[model samples]
Target chain A: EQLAQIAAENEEDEHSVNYKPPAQKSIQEIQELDKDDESLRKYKEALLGRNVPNVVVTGLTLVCSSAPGPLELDLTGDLESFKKQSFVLKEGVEYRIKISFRVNREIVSGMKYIQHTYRKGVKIDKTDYMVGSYGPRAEEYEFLTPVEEAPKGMLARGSYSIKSRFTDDDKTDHLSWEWNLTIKKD
Target chain B: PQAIKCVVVGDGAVGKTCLLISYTTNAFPGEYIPTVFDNYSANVMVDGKPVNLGLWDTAGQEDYDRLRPLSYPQTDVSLICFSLVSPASFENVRAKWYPEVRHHCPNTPIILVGTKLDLRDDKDTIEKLKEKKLTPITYPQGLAMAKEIGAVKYLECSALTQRGLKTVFDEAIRAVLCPPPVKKRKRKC
Candidate 1:
């Protein structure tokens, strides 16, 4: 519990303006460099691990607890279809978002998720997450966000439109999507 | 590097998001979803000088009519987009978008863009337009509108096929780096 508390605190620091992730060497270079050196080779082997892929991201999943059970929004399917419908969230329910992605070809640094929420036509809230670096890997990796509580006031019970973007240090937009959320009185 | 604030505005569903997304990411969106205009920046070299091109996308829905101009303050340039497949959107350049832009940023250069060039030649699209008693907006028509609205340049591009895409932004940067001589406004009695 103590270690986790410390880790959570340190994770908060990563989102600070002064925190910048250092550049990492390409996976292939790391794999080939000092391969003959036993200790260095072992370290590289542990770091690089197994099957690395080519692209970076695929989709996102939003999980939140509700009255009956946990509500899961599988955002991996057709993104366009998401706009046709809006998901309902009971006021005051806590929610967490997880992103599923694969690191491919080269190393990606300082990846982040940005979300803007608009009520009516005015922006009400913006959420930014500083997702860190990842090396090339064959299997996909999932990054889970910290839990956040939904607003519960009467005025907060309404529809909200959100634009979500996944970008990196180079300002490359890996993925972007539009979805709607509704806060219900239940 | 110096930053160029380029704002894109037009009627809704005119491929504004597609244009920005495809240019910034080099890939088109999978589906058509209504989205708000957000900031996307790119670093590129034009005429041996590096530029930080900051793109601003705005919502074209009537609901955002009041809030859209809030993004116009520091705009170095404006891209007024319409769909060749959408003659209504094309007409809006004169009827709505151009006047609004000129009102807010009179000194800013405007680039008139006709989006979805691929659809202009599609048979189904042609048939659909015929049903509406309309035709795909021709290039010359866009050029005429460009002149009519005093747009610095008129360019056509398709976000899906990636044809004539790079030139659009290249010309946009060129317009900023090398502006054309200003001509006095003339009136025909």
Candidate 2:
């Protein structure tokens, strides 16, 4: 109980500013890198840059600790529908899915993530037990899952959804969301 | 020197005036008054380039039907917006706004924005909609409408929470700066 008292005191320290989340710290790095007349101009431009690929990075929560910090695990696609609607895909077409996370500090938990493509309630392609060690110096975890074609016997023209689930192995945090799309036959 | 002229149009009370107020001064005038305006101009930036973005409002009343087309000239892009909770506003996208805009600026790209996005999942709002034997318009419905109307893209936002609001403008700038490819116009002899 006494140790818990000390931890609370440390949390109140103003130097907590030193523990800025990776995403915010990354912005600072870019700011410090900009020592020019057009710095503000360039910064605003950069902020608007992610719209090109329809990248929606939101749901940010900051938790500082050996615990699983507040993070927003988001998924994206090269297709505009990644953020808008489901895009149509042919059997042989290559589809890309990006899974990313925003972090407050390095997560030292025994955690893993799974990205699965589901059709008819069956899991098609999924990632293995990918561990987590991302922190403030490295805020985002980007994984590009590229499927060159529909799985064997799974080539029937229909609808599919990309669902990514991130879980802390230490049993700290879990998040999962899905995006829908259509698969077509030429 | 980059410039983009964006006009906001829809049936009355679809949040046209509030959408502009939210973007410029970061204020969401949730309540409404008898507001009237022809144009609002803004000097904004996009991708390191300066843009003079205009926010043009038109009357949904029948009196201005002929006068509204005057605002369409040289419009780099336009925001054809609707309230997600209002089915009539949604219907007017194709029935009214799309045809009207296309009549004048046939080449101008449009970004279909579903405003009042915050209410999409609001419990009380949903309940109210249920009593009326209706439901809130979903994202998929908006996207499909945008597609049907040949809009360049579809977006959703809430001015009260300021969610996805700036993106509505940033995308407007892009629609003008980098519009969808236009069909080749045969050279006039």
Candidate 3:
């Protein structure tokens, strides 16, 4: 952004009318205070009201044009089970990926999702989604992506492998899973 | 002489120690319950080539889970064994053993071994498992697991009867002597 570029270019500017930064308070202190005020109570509730477990990703759900319903998988469970089954995706149909995770202890900044799609051991596609920072909550945070169309054509119909990972800016990998997808014609 | 480090891993009580003791001592370790077995080296000839075979026994108990991988480094081949009479042990070959070995030694050759083969058809063993509505793992099941885990070979052995016991160690040596050829990927112009 132009503003970010200007801030970077001003390398030596120090005196700015003595602009003092605001003092940061502990999350516990903010939660303890203003229990009686209605607005403050709501504010505190919105801040740290959730207590999800420490791990980041809990589950993944794939909602698409397939028949019965959503394909839900436990992100924390044994990944070898995923190898025994293949998801049958109808060609040219739309699909959306959903992630379920929790923020605990502190705020998570620059959370990201990376996925690599391969066919017959050759990488064909790669995707990166920038999931922004989030504060701790008692309930799992659900991130639903926009709908994406599946590839169509006789050549595109084949077995494909996908490796997905969830990580943050600190390069901490929270979850990684490998799954197979089979696209077939109706 | 060249040395070949071969490690044996499986669930505790599945005869990993017995397999090594029987191979090295030329006798079954009857009822000797060492918390973990001692490592042994043997100067043996495999395919007319002599190599010092270093058999490293690992404790499969949950207590030694963290310490197990210390023996994995510099390993030429690994024997992933399971008791044929115990269905749970067979399942662990896929559930726990194969994944652990592959994680530590991604390129090491693995030989899927079905131990306690004598008990597979024993009436006493079958009757006990049948009382609980369980049966011994069949040969096809072991072969399928071998293919699933990408093991080079699947062999069944018994430390008691010593049937196919020698072949297990022989194949472990041959697997290292003649590693499988990797097919080259064709380049796209």
Candidate 4:
């Protein structure tokens, strides 16, 4: 910083000299700051490698197919199925959320809608809905949505409830499930 | 394998054309995508069996409503689409899709689909819906309507990203090969 003053000295001969830099924090001090500042800590971890964990549950039973997307799958049983996966993810890496359910009754004449809110303990993180129904004895219905890029920074961390309700002209039924997840950088 | 003609009908600009293009090409058209004014062909494998998937697009625009039904003659399955971002399109599924499809092919199995799957999370889209004092059509709403209209299944997808895109065609083929049970008619006493 003293060298910056030399250029401002109009009284002196045109010249420039540098000084030995002042004392600087050691690795321990730097590490201490990382622990104190959450943002700085994450920055250090990112340098080593980051593992952004996530959990997606499709069914109590699970099998997987690797696809160009997050996960392309072939799911069956109960005529209803679900699957889940968790791992470190970086910005360019991508994946998809696969989901499905079966109407076990011989004939289903009902409609179902669910608005699920995810929470990190007492804090709400996100919420979305899955609606629709299977026709009477329509063996199975399934969906494989497209891949999505993982966002940079913190991953969604939470354990939450998904409550769904089904109904017909005169009645209603309810279903609830849970998702527990954690994400971190190494 | 045999051909399964899956006729898609819904409101204009609802991504009917994009749906066909994505599944068949495995490529998404960039922003400012163009609409296909006619039929496009595709094939798929479902149930471990190969199927000749014939996709026919019908205009959802009111101007083409009268002329659209001509595509229905031998349709094996119908995909009645609505955009999750558009409540009117979802309502039209019940008000218009059901009647229009049934009028032409009373016995054909129908699949109700919600398109633009990705936009539901798109901030700008969510903001616009909020500005208009509108909420995206939830899945349950689509399901409830599917049941009311007697559809074989209720499904949704995003052609922009190809989410649930393949399954749409596969399910359409299944609708034809494994049609749902029809109730028996009673004889006059």
Candidate 5:
């Protein structure tokens, strides 16, 4: 009975172990390792999980000069529709995304030669995202996982869509592009 | 006798060509091919003395920065024209054009002429001009510029109506010929 109780206690202790664990190497050992690994290449890549590709959304067209106003977008069928789109971002995982713009010559010329030109565009990450309202705009956010141990069923997956809009003083135009991405254990 | 070399310099679209034509020819064109470092010579009698005037009209755009140094060689008088209708043109005159001309031709006599007085009667135009403290008759916007640049005189002219054209030319010529008396008494008094 005593042996059985000890086994059960050990099992309970294993279950209670936290996902994040303390560093194994001593300070001196870490320093010696850091000296040889100046670039931190092996340290970063091996210790860190994975490197993500920087995805760019391009080929967006816009109106040249127009009256000042706010533009809007509808992100319904884009790849960003996948659930669980956010990631806790593991260590050593680097990711980036960018959106670019283009304009037709006719619109460029008309705006350049006519009244003062005012054109602007921005990206929105989610369906609830609003332009110029902050929170989730055209900028990127980096995520870092808290610890070395992976949580059970803690996989990160999601689809993110970007919507863009431009407006002049009196007129407005809208366009959108979307993409999907997944984060998994190495 | 050699003619006085006078130059008309200002930012683009500020009526530099128009003012030059108004003074020399007194004719206003509905539109003009923007002046590109063109030289015009005329014979005028100032104070009953025949003085040949070589007027150089220059483009005021920033792309023409290299050509500016050559625009005012041996210049006796300079007319920095700023349109009353365009405050930006006027600021360009103060910020970019005038400083460059002064740096190149240090002692040349400058006359500040505010062009396009015909647009003064428009209420919105007048209001905008007033915001910059510029006026058709008062020339308050150009006063500090005239004083800072040591301008020989200040005048307002309407290329469309010929208003103040004669006075503008006369004052500029007088400043060129008989500048302010330089009283340099040696400190040995």
Candidate 6:
């Protein structure tokens, strides 16, 4: 009887140890675990896709003339490569272009100072059109330029460039941005 | 009867705190601390009966976006305040602020308020409104927007001058406390 009692007590102890509930975790610990799990999933998913390209340009200068002529601007090298890789132009399509300058407090001051100190014309122009001029005029704006058509065939598309002149008020220290676009084939 | 709970939301510097302070204390705070979230309660005697109002003031910062979904729950009414001097505040209220409240408290009454009406001397804002062809009358613009957004009511108030403050709260209470008309039941056989 003494041996049987000892055996029963041992069995009860083992059962209680095995069936014990999980250690209670504070809310903060659970939240931290959730955050870590989310970050790990995001990191793995990000590595599965191709990285997007970010193009950059340095030192943009503008000059304009009223000679009733269009100047051919060379868009060569990496820029041309980026355009070829990123876009495909189709025939009979409309495109719009928009250009904006970042003007902060310093830029505002510079523009004002240059205008008062020097007499110059600050001109900014933008426009939009279709690939074929005779077809239809795509919605356009002066500050926004849109090219409507591809020049024909698979011409070696190169660096996209525009020509313009800067005047006194345009001497403001402002950041400018430009974009090229084409419609995807249906 | 138990007091009705209302939540006030809007962009910063729109006199939300001022309006609440004005209504509760009959005085405006001299210096405004952009409310992150604050609460105030008021008792109104309507037809010689006391009705309590529990107003919750929420911060207008975009970073505080997470709090909004939780703000409007169990709310009986909501007040969206905008400043006539800052149309951007009004735009933010419409675009970012009100939608969040509506998403959570779809059936709650919403009141649109245009503040800083005393700053009529600021001609730049008035000219901008005119350029947009918004009504030269500021309150009407708020009212029209409220109607468009399905608000229960709209009012223009200047916490500085105490203009239209009482009327705004009174109307809000009436909307919340008044029950919908009951249908007359048919006689049983």
Top model by DockQ, which number? 3
Best by TM-score: 3
Q: Where does candidate 1 stray beyond 4 Å?
A: A1-186, B32-34, B181-189
Worst 10 residues of 1 chain A by lDDT: A1-10
lDDT for each residue of candidate 4 in B1-189, tens digit (9 for 90 to 100): 688888888988898878877777788866744434345556567888777877776556554333344456557899998899998788877677777676456567989999998998889988878898898988888889988888888898999889998888878888889775654211100
The Cα error of candidate 5 at residue B100, in Å, is 1.2
Range of the 10 consecutive residues with the lowest summed lDDT in candidate 6 chain A: A110-119
In angstroms, how far off is B180's CA in candidate 5?
A: 2.2
TM-score of chain B of each: 0.93, 0.91, 0.95, 0.92, 0.83, 0.82
- Residue-wise C-alpha lDDT for candidate 5, range A90-113, written one tens digit per residue: 322322212232322111100000
State residue B92's C-alpha deviation in candidate 2, in Å.
Answer: 1.1
**Candidate 1 docking DockQ:** 0.01
TM of chain B vs. native, candidate 4: 0.92
Top candidate, metric lDDT: 3
Q: Which ten residues in a row have the lowest lDDT in candidate 5 chain A?
A: A108-117
Q: What tens digits encode model 2's per-residue C-alpha lDDT throughout A39-93?
A: 2323223222221211223332222222243433234334333435665544544
Q: Candidate 4, residues A10-76: lDDT per residue as tens digits?
A: 3322122121211222234434543554533443332212121111123321122333344222322
Give DockQ per model, in order: 0.01, 0.01, 0.02, 0.01, 0.01, 0.01
lDDT of 1 at B13: 90
Return the TM-score for chain B, candidate 6. Answer: 0.82
Per-residue CA lDDT of model 3 for A1-186, tens digit only, reads 012221121232221121111133345665565446454444344334543444578887888766785688887757898877678878877678787888776655456688877666666655565554466666878876556677764555767788888875456687888889887887
Worst 10 residues of 6 chain B by lDDT: B180-189
Full-model lDDT for every candidate: 0.72, 0.58, 0.73, 0.55, 0.48, 0.48
TM-score (chain B) for model 1?
Answer: 0.93
Question: In terms of TM-score, which candidate is stronger, 2 or 3?
Answer: 3
**Residue A62 C-alpha lDDT in model 2:** 20
